[PDB]
Amino acid sequence: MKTILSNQTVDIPENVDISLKGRTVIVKGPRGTLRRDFNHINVELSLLGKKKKRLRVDKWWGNRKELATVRTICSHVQNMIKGVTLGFRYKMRSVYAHFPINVVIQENGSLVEIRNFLGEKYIRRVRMRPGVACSVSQAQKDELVLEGNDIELVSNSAALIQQATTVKNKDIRKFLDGIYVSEKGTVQQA
Amino acid sequence: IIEPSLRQLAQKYNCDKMICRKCYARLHPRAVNCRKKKCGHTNNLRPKKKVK
Amino acid sequence: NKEHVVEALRRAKFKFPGRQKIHISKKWGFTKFNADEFEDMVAEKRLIPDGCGVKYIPNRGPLDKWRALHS
Amino acid sequence: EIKVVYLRCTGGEVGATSALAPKIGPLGLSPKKVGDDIAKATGDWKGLRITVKLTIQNRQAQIEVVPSASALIIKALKEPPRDRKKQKNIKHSGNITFDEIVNIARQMRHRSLARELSGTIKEILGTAQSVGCNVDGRHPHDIIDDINSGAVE
Amino acid sequence: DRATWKSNYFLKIIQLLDDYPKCFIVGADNVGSKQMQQIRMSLRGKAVVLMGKNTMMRKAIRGHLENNPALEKLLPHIRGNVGFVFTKEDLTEIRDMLLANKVPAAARAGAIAPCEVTVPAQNTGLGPEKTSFFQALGITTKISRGTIEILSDVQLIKTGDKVGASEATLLNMLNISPFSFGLIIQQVFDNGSIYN
Amino acid sequence: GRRPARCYRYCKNKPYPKSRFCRGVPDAKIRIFDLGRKKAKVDEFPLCGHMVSDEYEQLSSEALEAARICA
RNA sequence: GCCCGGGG
RNA sequence: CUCAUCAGACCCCAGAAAAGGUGUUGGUUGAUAUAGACAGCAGGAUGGUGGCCAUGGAAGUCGGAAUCCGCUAAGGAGUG
Ligand SMILES: [Mg+2]
Ligand SMILES: [Mg+2]
Ligand SMILES: [Zn+2]
Numbered sequence: 001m002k003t004i005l006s007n008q009t010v011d012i013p014e015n016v017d018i019s020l021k022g023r024t025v026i027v028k029g030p031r032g033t034l035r036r037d038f039n040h041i042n043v044e045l046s047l048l049g050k051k052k053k054r055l056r057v058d059k060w061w062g063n064r065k066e067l068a069t070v071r072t073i074c075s076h077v078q079n080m081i082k083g084v085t086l087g088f089r090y091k092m093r094s095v096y097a098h099f100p101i102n103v104v105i106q107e108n109g110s111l112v113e114i115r116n117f118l119g120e121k122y123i124r125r126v127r128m129r130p131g132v133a134c135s136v137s138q139a140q141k142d143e144l145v146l147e148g149n150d151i152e153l154v155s156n157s158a159a160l161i162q163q164a165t166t167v168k169n170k171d172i173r174k175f176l177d178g179i180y181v182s183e184k185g186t187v188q189q190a
Numbered sequence: 191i192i193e194p195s196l197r198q199l200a201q202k203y204n205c206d207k208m209i210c211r212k213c214y215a216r217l218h219p220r221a222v223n224c225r226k227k228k229c230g231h232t233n234n235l236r237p238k239k240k241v242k
Numbered sequence: 243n244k245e246h247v248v249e250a251l252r253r254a255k256f257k258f259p260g261r262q263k264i265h266i267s268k269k270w271g272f273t274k275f276n277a278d279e280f281e282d283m284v285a286e287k288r289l290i291p292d293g294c295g296v297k298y299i300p301n302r303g304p305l306d307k308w309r310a311l312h313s
Numbered sequence: 314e315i316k317v318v319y320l321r322c323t324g325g326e327v328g329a330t331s332a333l334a335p336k337i338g339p340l341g342l343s344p345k346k347v348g349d350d351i352a353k354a355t356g357d358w359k360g361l362r363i364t365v366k367l368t369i370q371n372r373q374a375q376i377e378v379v380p381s382a383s384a385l386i387i388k389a390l391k392e393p394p395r396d397r398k399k400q401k402n403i404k405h406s407g408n409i410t411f412d413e414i415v416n417i418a419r420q421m422r423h424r425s426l427a428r429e430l431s432g433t434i435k436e437i438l439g440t441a442q443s444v445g446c447n448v449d450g451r452h453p454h455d456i457i458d459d460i461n462s463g464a465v466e
Numbered sequence: 467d468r469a470t471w472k473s474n475y476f477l478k479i480i481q482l483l484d485d486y487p488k489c490f491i492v493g494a495d496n497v498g499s500k501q502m503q504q505i506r507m508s509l510r511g512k513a514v515v516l517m518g519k520n521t522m523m524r525k526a527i528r529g530h531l532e533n534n535p536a537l538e539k540l541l542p543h544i545r546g547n548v549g550f551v552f553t554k555e556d557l558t559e560i561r562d563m564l565l566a567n568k569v570p571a572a573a574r575a576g577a578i579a580p581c582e583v584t585v586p587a588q589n590t591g592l593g594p595e596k597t598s599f600f601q602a603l604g605i606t607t608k609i610s611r612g613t614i615e616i617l618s619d620v621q622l623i624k625t626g627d628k629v630g631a632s633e634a635t636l637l638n639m640l641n642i643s644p645f646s647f648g649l650i651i652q653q654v655f656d657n658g659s660i661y662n
Numbered sequence: 663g664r665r666p667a668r669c670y671r672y673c674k675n676k677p678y679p680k681s682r683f684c685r686g687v688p689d690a691k692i693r694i695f696d697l698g699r700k701k702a703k704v705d706e707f708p709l710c711g712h713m714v715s716d717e718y719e720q721l722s723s724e725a726l727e728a729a730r731i732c733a
Numbered sequence: 734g735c736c737c738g739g740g741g
Numbered sequence: 742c743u744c745a746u747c748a749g750a751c752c753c754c755a756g757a758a759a760a761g762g763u764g765u766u767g768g769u770u771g772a773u774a775u776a777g778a779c780a781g782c783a784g785g786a787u788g789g790u791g792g793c794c795a796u797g798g799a800a801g802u803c804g805g806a807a808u809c810c811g812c813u814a815a816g817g818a819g820u821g
Contacts, residue, residue: 001766049740064765095196162203173241176192176200212761223763227746231762247711250733257729259671259759260717267710277708284705291704321791321800330797364791364800383792404794404806426500426788432811436789439809443818444793452809472776475814496784503787503812517814521777529776542737547784549814576783668758 006067008074009048009056016081018052020045025055025077029084031149031187036080041069083149087187090158094142094165094179101165101179103144109133112144117165118177124164129153144179147187155181207238271295287311316340316369322351325359326394342371350374358384360394382440385420389413390446405445414438414448415464422466430466435459478516479526479550486513486552487536490561493652495547496577501569501647508567513553513560520544536658543653543660557656568646573629573637579644583623586642589613599636667722690723697730 012018017028023038023045038045044058055077057070082088094101104113112134114124128134132148134157144161148154158181165178192200208217210224211234217224223231244266251264270277273295283289289296290311299311318340321332333347343350351365352358354376361384367377380388390407414434421433438448438455448455492515505515527541553560573579585605593612600607608615622637623629623644637643653662680687699707713729715721 053740093196093199095192095200097192171241173201173205173238176197176204178200180199180203182199227762227764229762231764233762244709244711247709251711251713254713254729254733256760257725257732258713258721259667259725260715260719263714263716265712265714267712269710271704271707271710273704280708281705294700294702294704296704319791321798328797332798361793362791362798366791381792382789385789387793399795401794421789424788426503426812428811433789435810437810439811440789440792440807440818441809443807443809445807476776499785499787499815500812502785502814506812519777519814521775525776 002061002063003059003067004061006059006062006070007056008070009054010074010077010081012053012055012081013085015085018047018055018081020047020055025080027077027080027084029081031084031087034080034083034149036076038073038076041073042066043070043073045073079151080149082186083151085188086190088146088148088151088154089183089185089187090146090154090181091137091183091185092144092146092158092161092179093182094144096142096177097175099177101142101177103136103179105134105136105144109135112161112164114161114165114179118167118175126157126160126164128157128160132157143182155184205238205240208235209238210234211236314371316371317366318369320347320351320365320367322348322363322365324361324363325349325352325355326396337369340369342369342373346373354378357388357391361387380420382421382437383444385417386413386437386441386444386446389417407446409441409446409448411448411458411464431463434463434465475518476522476526479523482514482516482550482552483530483534483537486554488553488657489537489540489655490551490553490651491540491543491653491655492549492551492564492649493546494549494649496647497649498569498571498647501567505564505567505649509553509560509563512555513551515549515551517549520548523550537655539658539660540655543655546652548652564649567649570643570646572641573634573643575629575631575634575638577629577634579623579629580625581623581645582621582625583629583644584619584621585616586640587616587619589615590640599632602632664724667725670722671719673718673720692723692727692730694730 015029019026019028023041023043025034025036025038025045027034044056044060046056046058048054048056055074057073059066059070094103099116099119101117102115104115105111106113110128110132112124112126112128114126117124128146129150130153131150132146132153135145135147137143137145146154146158148157161179162181167175167177206219208219208221209215210217210226210229210232212229212232213224213226215224215226215229216238217235221235223233224235225231247266248264251262255262255264268276268278270280271294273280275283275289275296275298280289284291284296288299290299299307318336320337322328323332328348331344331348334344337347338344350373351363351367353374355363355378363384364379364381365377366379368375386409387405389409390405390413392403392405392407395403414437415430418430418434418437421427421436422430427433427436438452438459441448442451442455448458502515502517524541524544527537530537551560551564591613594609595614597607597609605620606617608617622633629644653660678684
């Protein structure tokens with residue numbers, strides 16, 4: 001069945017200046033600007049209401065695999081909106097059993113130096129994705145804080161740390177040590 | 191040892207999983223079908239075994 | 243016990259080569275008579291229950307069988 | 314000083330180990346007699362583990378008896394006690410009467426989380442056939458008496 | 467069985483309509499079970515509160531479009547966790563019995579307190595333990611002589627502000643509650659007249 | 663011991679019963695054809711479900727016993 | 734047409 | 742209609758089955774639905790009862806037999 005029309009609208013706040021050049025979305029907020037391109041999807045992106053209040057997404061004549069890409073665009077634009085308003089803060093905790101995991105942050109918060117993960121002499125060097133700040137959180141013993149505007153770079157950098165501190169050639173249900181994403185929130189709460 | 195607040199966090203990504211019986215894939219805990227094409231997206235799933 | 247019947251034959255299917263269907267019959271048990279018409283035609287003394295199945299009583303025998311059935 | 318606390322005893326028959334000590338031991342009063350100090354004025358039970366919340370004074374306890382409904386309808390028609398043998402067919406047998414319905418549905422009025430006693434002459438009767446005793450029959454005779462014809466406060 | 471209990475719930479609304487032509491539209495979320503049984507059992511002859519889905523009672527207005535013309539002005543009012551109170555007696559006696567109908571419960575971790583909540587400065591009676599969860603924002607604790615002593619009264623909750631998880635857990639181990647369970651009113655409909 | 667059933671799945675030959683011309687035939691693996699309450703009356707078990715074949719094929723006695731054990 | 738809702 | 746990180750492509754004929762797939766498309770049957778459903782977000786989970794029987798004790802929270810009531814919007818003598 002070719003559904004004649006699937007639409008979904010996203011409400012855009014007063015704090016955000018949004019723009020579109022075809023199927024790229026340029027979201028502007030207090031924390032900076034996010035561009036994301038969507039020419040891989042073939043939708044209609046309408047910017048309706050003067051003062052640009054609602055962003056509307058249309059898919060005309062789509063089967064199920066094309067209808068599933070409307071709400072994906074709306075959720076991506078929403079994640080960009082919360083990226084430029086409130087940011088993204090991924091709080092990782094460093095679980096250890098016997099060997100304390102020593103984390104040293106270098107280059108403004110763009111490189112992680114992981115040492116003594118399970119008593120290894122090998123030092124893990126994890127380079128952050130561009131624009132993601134990395135920081136050891138105060139008032140907490142073994143925690144690390146990732147802050148940014150792109151959720152897909154913040155969460156990918158968290159995944160890079162997590163898959164860098166992986167246990168090999170043992171039982172991972174007993175050898176539970178590593179640095180794991182514990183909280184997913186924003187930089188600025190609301 | 192490890193405090194249980196951190197132990198639940200480690201167990202969430204380490205053993206709170208469902209395992210395909212045909213291709214041993216490590217799937218999310220609410221999985222009904224396996225994600226891998228090699229098992230034909232089968233629904234023969236077991237819980238991942240826990241340590242004693 | 244209908245779903246238990248269907249799962250029993252569906253499990254027993256795998257012992258057999260080829261393709262088998264599972265069909266809930268229109269009849270009443272192991273009889274040649276339909277399950278809907280069965281009970282009132284027992285009531286009208288057209289089927290006398292005889293062990294596992296029934297015996298059909300037609301309107302064709304000697305009348306002493308009809309008197310013995312309708313006594 | 315007035316004390317109120319949960320308590321579980323064996324009633325009248327002698328038990329092997331106390332079930333009262335881990336809370337009322339440091340309460341000052343005697344934690345030794347409490348295997349049968351909840352049997353001061355039983356009268357009817359004498360062989361059953363009775364569940365009691367009573368009022369505790371600083372010297373010894375005070376008489377406050379709140380039963381089970383199962384115990385209440387076991388002691389509608391009294392059964393003899395047994396020792397630690399505990400043989401078969403100790404399940405209650407004996408036809409409860411309407412008098413023994415309406416004497417101990419009064420114990421369902423003074424908890425007062427119900428309807429009036431009309432609602433509880435079904436409640437204790439629904440306990441009665443579960444514990445094993447009947448009023449002139451089981452429920453397809455009890456509800457016959459209970460519809461439009463149950464005597465009540 | 468249920469296919470007649472739908473219209474029997476409707477006929478229970480009808481039983482209240484056929485005795486009582488005025489409404490105290492109560493909006494009461496998270497009320498207690500046994501105390502709501504007691505709500506039925508308290509003023510049982512003169513008022514009772516029913517519980518259910520607001521959209522059936524708003525459809526019952528169009529079911530009574532011109533046979534109960536009083537309740538026609540009660541459609542766009544019903545918002546929230548709403549029960550219905552139907553009374554004949556007065557505007558005073560049933561209301562000031564429902565005003566003090568209270569029961570305490572421990573401080574909820576995820577809910578709100580609608581007034582300014584204070585902290586009881588007294589001893590707890592239990593010995594040394596962890597401390598800093600009460601100094602999470604700066605409120606002092608003077609642990610001395612075994613019992614846990616608080617110095618003075620720095621208030622817990624400001625009006626219009628939420629009561630979070632950690633600070634409610636502080637009062638859950640302390641057995642301190644901000645207020646009790648209230649049967650709060652939203653709007654009323656008195657004999658063909660709509661006030662607040 | 664015995665061949666897999668794919669050797670004798672299809673009804674290729676003419677029917678060949680045991681008779682005075684076919685001797686030295688071992689007994690079938692299946693012997694009992696009725697299970698459960700055989701002595702149940704006709705009004706006690708009204709619902710009947712069939713496993714109906716969809717092919718002109720040959721079912722072994724070993725399979726006919728395995729399916730009746732499974733069911 | 735009338736009523737409700739919001740977008741100029 | 743169909744996407745194949747093994748696609749498919751024309752009698753004989755030149756290679757495949759049982760079984761399986763919340764891939765995707767259709768159809769059949771039955772419910773559960775504007776007397777407002779299904780997720781999702783919260784709230785209540787009641788007294789009789791802390792049940793006779795076993796088991797030291799099991800109080801819905803090891804087990805087998807009991808599976809009724811009422812105030813009810815509801816709650817099984819209780820799924821973990
Ligand atoms: Mg090894
Ligand atoms: Mg041949
Ligand atoms: Zn698999």
